[PDB]
Amino acid sequence: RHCPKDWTFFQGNCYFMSNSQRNWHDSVTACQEVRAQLVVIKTAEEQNFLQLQTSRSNRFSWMGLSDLNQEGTWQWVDGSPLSPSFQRYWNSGEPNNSGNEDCAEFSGSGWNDNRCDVDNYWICKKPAACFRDE
Ligand SMILES: N=C(N)NCc1cn([C@@H]2[C@@H](OCCCl)O[C@H](CO)[C@@H](O)[C@@H]2O)nn1
Numbered sequence: 001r002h003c004p005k006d007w008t009f010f011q012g013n014c015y016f017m018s019n020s021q022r023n024w025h026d027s028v029t030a031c032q033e034v035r036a037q038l039v040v041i042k043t044a045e046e047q048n049f050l051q052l053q054t055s056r057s058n059r060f061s062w063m064g065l066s067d068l069n070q071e072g073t074w075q076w077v078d079g080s081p082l083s084p085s086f087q088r089y090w091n092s093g094e095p096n097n098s099g100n101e102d103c104a105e106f107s108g109s110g111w112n113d114n115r116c117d118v119d120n121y122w123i124c125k126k127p128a129a130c131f132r133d134e
């Protein structure tokens with residue numbers, strides 16, 4: 001199974017680590033432009049994959065998670081809630097809402113809540129295909 005050039009294959013999906021920095025809303029749009037989605041994490045193994053991808057490039061990166069709803073709870077850009085077994089991935093002391101932080105990112109060894117208006121790297125996810133989707 002194939003991924004586009006400069007996407008990474010992991011367990012049937014393709015992952016794009018951005019070369020540029022954009023705000024969270026612009027990162028949502030950027031992933032949609034390439035038939036993809038600002039990354040929604042579905043399994044522990046996927047989180048482990050992504051956390052090490054980001055940790056080693058030492059890059060802070062947007063994921064598809066925000067509390068921009070009425071409840072103020074963390075929900076994925078596909079509308080699914082943050083499951084209890086993922087609360088462990090927040091960094092020590094996070095989320096801390098330090099300056100109106102509604103958008104989740106990879107930060108060091110876990111997750112951070114950041115201001116949505118910050119320019120950050122991002123990761124897109126789409127299914128692997130029989131062809132390279134350029
Ligand atoms: N995309 C990037 N640069 N991510 C890293 C990052 C973290 N923060 C904040 C900062 O707050 C301190 C005042 Cl800037 O660091 C605290 C952790 O100590 C945070 O909880 C808080 O979200 N701002 N950028």
Ligand SMILES: [Ca+2]
Pocket residue numbers: 094095096097098101112113114
């Ligand atoms: Ca924070």
Ligand SMILES: [Cl-]
Pocket residue numbers: 018019020
């Ligand atoms: Cl880019």
